[PDB]
Amino acid sequence: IGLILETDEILNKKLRERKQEELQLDYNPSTGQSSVLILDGGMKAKPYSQISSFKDLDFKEDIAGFNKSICLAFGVPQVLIDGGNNANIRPNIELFYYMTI
Amino acid sequence: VTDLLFEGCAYIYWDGTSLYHVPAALMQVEADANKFIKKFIFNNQINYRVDEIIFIKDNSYVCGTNSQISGQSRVATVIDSLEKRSKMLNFKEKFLDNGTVIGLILETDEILNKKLRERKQEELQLDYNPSTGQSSVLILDGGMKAKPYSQISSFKDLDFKEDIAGFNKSICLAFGVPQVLIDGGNNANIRPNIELFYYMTIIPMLNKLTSSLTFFFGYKITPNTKEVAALTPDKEAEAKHLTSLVNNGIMTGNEARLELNLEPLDDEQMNRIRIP
Amino acid sequence: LNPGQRIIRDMEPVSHRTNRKPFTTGQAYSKIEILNRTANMVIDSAAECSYTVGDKYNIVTYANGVKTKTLDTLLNVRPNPFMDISTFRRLVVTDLLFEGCAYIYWDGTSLYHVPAALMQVEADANKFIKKFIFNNQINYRVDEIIFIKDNSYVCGTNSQISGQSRVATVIDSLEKRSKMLNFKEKFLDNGTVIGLILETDEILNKKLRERKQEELQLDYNPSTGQSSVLILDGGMKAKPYSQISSFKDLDFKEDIAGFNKSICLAFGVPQVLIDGGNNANIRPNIELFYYMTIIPMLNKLTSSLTFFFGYKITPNTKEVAALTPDKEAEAKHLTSLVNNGIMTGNEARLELNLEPLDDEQMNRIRIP
Amino acid sequence: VTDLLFEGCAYIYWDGTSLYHVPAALMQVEADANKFIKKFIFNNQINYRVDEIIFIKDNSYVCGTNSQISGQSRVATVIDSLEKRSKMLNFKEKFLDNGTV
Amino acid sequence: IPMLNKLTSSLTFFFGYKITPNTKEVAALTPDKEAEAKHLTSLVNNGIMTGNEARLELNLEPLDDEQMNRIRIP
């Protein structure tokens, strides 16, 4: 939601819908220029907040754990999934070959 | 290689003295009851005899049966991720076009002449912005109230960055190309990673192909990398390797010339071991 | 021949283009910096590889019987009486990259670039290709064209004949990035910056109110004026307010960086070449860029020329000043091979670009 | 080098035993129907014969056509940014003079 | 160097001579006095390069003593 406006009056539905589309196209900087808004006749702007946010879906470590489990069940080092430095890479191939295969 | 990667199979006709690629999407393999394969069917419209096709297949475990005959597509496992990532990217864009950016809210219980109200809005908008205009203090009279507000949903909460990075890693991993090749790193990173990519990913594919050709022709057949400019070893190490083996009488001179791509030289001594 | 050909022919009887959006692509290349730079780096780097002409295979071919010295002069020196070698190469590489195909006419003793956007390929029912159609207005015979194509997987068919455009995959990102940048600008011009709000229930003489606003504005700013305390009387109230939407929430920086990486990746140029790094970074990265990206392209081209002429043909990098090896290592390599009697002296002179010296010993191996 | 960088083209006359720079902003190239280039036109007011000019051009991809003859300016791609930066800097200054303390 | 290669390739097309740019006048590039001496000395003593070729690369006039234009084998 971008904005909430509120009244105790009853408003003509067709004109209300038109007004919503005018505000939406005018205020966005991509579409339109206008930015100040003047309310009259008692329309009130209602403050609100994002009651549930994408920020709380910090899955990132849990899925990483599952990837490690899968990678571990076969027994392939992560350096082979990434590629690292020389000192990492050349011994890890021998690790993978000798221990697993 | 396109057919082998995307479909998971490849077929080649042979015609005495010709090899022809045959599109893998149109072939079909029919199992024999006694031998391995009875015939190959193309587009349901022609049957190739078994001794006239060279057949290659990737691994296959299907519907809970380990599968002879069939081949798993490699690329088929990646599409799920390409969809989700595209969705996020489109959402990331479209939130901006659906956006709504307010600078100020003014409010009254009176009713105001609409045409003059619109003019006043345009005057305030052009005057207050520093780019357009100078004025900055605002004096309200007759009871217009300034209403405090807040951005009820913000772009800050679209921290997609790690999730899309995960999807890129998945795609990059399905082919099996190290990220150092997508970035470029330091020397110690870069030079071994090329050998990692070549030996682990490509050489098993070519071993599948060459083992099928050695089965068909019966010759020993195997791939040579040493034409590849990417792999070609360092001019320093190779010289000390070859020199030390040559002087200690393990390897003849012309064998070294050959390994350096040079024509053998017919001086007999060049095909002699030197003991000391 | 191939019994299936009559069927394959019907799967794709005529080529079709893949560089849709040609106009917006030409706009992008003409207007967006990172595309222009990366494309120019690729074209200008590939154009300066020399070609070496090798031995001749005995098999028969189309371009029969051409003497090696002529072919060498055409490839290395002068493609035709009217156009240089560098312009010819850059045109061919431009077509190969942008459209995904390249075509070259041959006319006894001339090679001419033919624009890839106007050619079309018609499949034969028995052989590979029947004829090439230019602008629907002239047909070239098959043994008079050299044809190159990039990979192609189209509409769920692996595609002979056709070629995928490389650049076509990048436009989606160039649009989105431009949108963000324009939004990033325009939010500033749509902005609104208030310094103070004063309020009354009385009604005030408009002309005097405007004068008072201009007096306060000029007086209070430290650049213009001195005064800083403010005394309000008669009931003017100062209304507290807050910035209801702030520039701080436009933290675009990583998203646009992602799009730059995508563009940079589509050509396959390492970021170290866009930045410049340390020596250990920089010197290997040039070899990475050359060998992985450019040399496969030139191998596509040279394999098509060896098919057409029948000579062995392959590209030589050793003219390239960027690649040319370190003066120290090369000397110890060559010296050690020469003294240990693996390589003759004149072979080393040759590798150092020096003319062979006719002293017989210079063409002898020295054993000790 | 100035002409080659800024305009994207450079032209040099030759006169037996003289080379003269010819300003790239005033030259124009006319395509031949059989050969490469028919003649060079200077300021619409003199035509140079083809064997009397040395011609250099940077890369060119224009209006969706890969372009012979023409050359892309290098510097032309930079102006968009120089404007925006200047705007920010001016705003950064003027906020201080519009200030109120 | 790509810019100058564009220019020189146009001049070689026009005149027909081989034409190419030399950097070695550029004071910025000019190599380190230590490395260059060991490079040149080692190539000269091992009989790959004649003496006057080294003088030339050091911007020195060739010296007319015949031996200076001879290879020394050992």
TrEMBL record, chain E:
Protein's name in the database: Portal protein
Organism: Escherichia phage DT57C
